[PDB]
Amino acid sequence: CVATRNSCKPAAAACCDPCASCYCRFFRSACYCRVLSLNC
């Protein structure tokens, strides 16, 4: 699955990260699983 800051679109298993979240950027079209905790 998606390790980190790779891809969001959680189809079936491409965003494994219970310590992160689906973050988006300016584009807002290519979101990825980014850890917005900085604690894990």
From Swiss-Prot:
It is found in: Secreted. Widely expressed at low levels. Highly expressed in the skin. Expressed in adipose tissue. Residues 1-40 form the Agouti domain. Disulfide bonds join C1-C16, C8-C22, C15-C33, C19-C40, C24-C31. Involved in the regulation of melanogenesis. The binding of ASP to MC1R precludes alpha-MSH initiated signaling and thus blocks production of cAMP, leading to a down-regulation of eumelanogenesis (brown/black pigment) and thus increasing synthesis of pheomelanin (yellow/red pigment). In higher primates, agouti may affect the quality of hair pigmentation rather than its pattern of deposition. Could well play a role in neuroendocrine aspects of melanocortin action. May have some functional role in regulating the lipid metabolism with adipocytes. It is linked to Obesity and hypopigmentation: An autosomal dominant disorder characterized by early-onset obesity, overgrowth, hyperinsulinemia, and hypopigmentation of the skin. Some affected individuals experience hyperphagia and exhibit reduced energy expenditure. The presence of a 'disulfide through disulfide knot' structurally defines this protein as a knottin. This is Agouti-signaling protein. It comes from Homo sapiens (Human). The lineage of its organism: Eukaryota, Metazoa, Chordata, Craniata, Vertebrata. The gene is ASIP. The chain holds residues 93 to 132 of 132 of the full protein.
